[PDB]
Amino acid sequence: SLSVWTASSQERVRQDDPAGESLNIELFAARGEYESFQVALKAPEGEHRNVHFVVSDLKGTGDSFISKSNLTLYREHYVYISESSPQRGTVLPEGPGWYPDALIPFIDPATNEPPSGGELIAVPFALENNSNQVIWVDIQVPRDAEAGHYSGSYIVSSEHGEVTGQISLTVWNFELPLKPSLKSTFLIWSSRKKSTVEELLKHKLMCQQWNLSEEEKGAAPTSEGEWIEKYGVNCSGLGFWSKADTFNGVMPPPPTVEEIQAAASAHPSNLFLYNYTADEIGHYTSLYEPIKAWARNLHEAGVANLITMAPVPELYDDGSGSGRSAVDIWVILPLQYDKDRIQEVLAKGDEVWSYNCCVQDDYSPKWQIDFNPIEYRIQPGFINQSLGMTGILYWRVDFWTEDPWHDVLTLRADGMEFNGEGMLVYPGEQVGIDGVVPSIRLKAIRKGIEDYEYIEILKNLGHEQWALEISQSVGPDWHNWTKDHHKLEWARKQLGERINDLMTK
Ligand SMILES: [Mg+2]
């Protein structure tokens, strides 16, 4: 007895969930966009020792065709959380238990062939009594794909079972740019491989190396031109760190204009440059004059100043006489949001970005594994657009425990435990490959970056307010945002149908 059903991308499938009602999926997407779905499996009676899973090509009218090479398959790995993330307010974690999060790849990206010799293998796999298994399916729509309807199949098979489900995909007559409109800064502290950067870029996230040795500080950004071409890299940091942080309220004099210009000229031209100058120093009012000194030198070199602090009117003028702010990219937590200050800085030409960590308030989306999966998607797209925010930052992606496939309690502090804090990718060793593999949460971030793009496209077409009415219906602010994946899917489809229509006049 083999029970099969589908689930949407941001639907969590628990090991003990009952079987759903459909084993088909219907999706909609633009050229250059991903859409994903899950195939959940249960053996209500007995066991299946040897379960396999394949997909077809997707075929449309006439010669229209999307190769199965555009589909990426993974088996979900469940991790056991024994200590809850903090429980406060109305946005709560779901409790100790098994959570699907790491993704076991069918294919090693290095070879384009199945891994061999891993401790954990995607297929074949055993389906044991009552504990569900789940396949994650990514579909990347080719940049050139013909608009219209496509269909294909997935096949689950075992020694006593074979079940075939339909994949239905509608390709809309628009494209998402290779270069994401949303800018980002996601920090890598430990895994210095080019495959680590590439895994993040494939998910539309821009990264910077952090905690670099004095020796490797200032190495030349050798690969950046390649990554612009291949992955649409949309910004880069110069790496002048002041060392000022929450614990260190002191700033030295800035690097000279000449030094900043030399750093800038190592990067490709026609690339937005910023400098992450200081972190969470909003309490230290002594630092305002030093921040303006840094700003003036960066501005003379055509470089943007990025600080994780909230807009303060004392820093709306860098002291140069131009009227430009001392901070060009203000990066804030949900809890720091102040509508009036944000309106002031957007009006004068600055950017505001969001960042997240820990569990610091009662109401905002929280980035831990034991929270609703929607919280990783809703922040970069709908809420950011509702509030006029134009980027996202995250402090670390590789904060692994010593047993990273089995222990995801990555931070313990002040009597609190955090599940997945600073960890969005998993090491490949456990699945027999050299490079990192993605999490389910990284897939949600990617999707939210695509949601942002839908809204940006409508803004660019002259339909900003129309798009914000929709955005504000599901994610107006940090307090009031939907917990229901169906409503976000509904909102996205309204946006996508409209763009389709406007491009087919
Ligand atoms: Mg505890």
Residue numbers in the entry: 9 to 513
What text comes from the article?
Beta-N-acetylgalactosaminidases (β-NGAs) hydrolyze the different β-GalNAc linkages of various glycans to modulate the length, combination, and abundance of glycans. Despite low sequence similarity, the crystal structures of these enzymes demonstrate that all enzymes share a prototype structure and have diversified their substrate specificities (oligosaccharide-releasing, oligosaccharide/monosaccharide-releasing, and monosaccharide-releasing) through the accumulation of mutations and insertional amino acid sequences. The overall structure of these enzymes is similar to that of CpNga123 and BvGH123, which consist of a β-sandwich domain at the N-terminus and a (β/α)8-barrel domain encompassing the catalytic region. Among Groups 1–4 and GH123, the DE motif is located at the same position, suggesting that these enzymes adopt the substrate-assisted catalysis reported for GH123 MR-β-NGAs.
Surprisingly, Group 1 NgaCa displayed strictly OR-type enzymatic activity and acted solely on Galβ1-3GalNAc-β-pNP. NgaCa in Group 1 had the simplest structure among the enzymes analyzed. The active site of NgaCa possesses a cleft shape that allows oligosaccharides to pass through to the −2 subsite, enabling oligosaccharide binding and OR-type β-NGA activity. Furthermore, three characteristic tryptophan residues (W197, W218, and W249) are located in the subsites −2 and −3. A docking model of NgaCa with oligosaccharide suggested that these tryptophan residues may play a role in a stacking-type interaction with sugars located in subsites −2 and −3. This structural feature indicated that Group 1 enzymes may act on the inner regions of longer sugar chains, in addition to disaccharides from the non-reducing end (e.g., Galβ1-3GalNAc-β-pNP). The increased number of residues could potentially reinforce substrate recognition in Group 4 and GH123 enzymes. Additional structural analyses (comparison of crystal structure with AlphaFold2 predicted structure of NgaCa, comparison of apo1-form and apo2-form of NgaCa, and comparison of GalNAc-thiazoline-bond form and GlcNAc-thiazoline-/apo-form of NgaAt, NgaDssm, and NgaP2) data are illustrated in Supplementary Fig. 13. The anomeric hydrogen signal of Galβ-1-3GalNAcβ-pNP (between the GalNAc and pNP moieties) disappeared within 1 min for NgaDssm and 10 min for NgaCa and Galβ-1-3GalNAcβ appeared, while Galβ-1-3GalNAcα anomeric signals appeared after 10 and 30 min, respectively, due to mutarotation. These results indicate that NgaDssm and NgaCa are anomer-retaining enzymes, similar to GH123 enzymes.
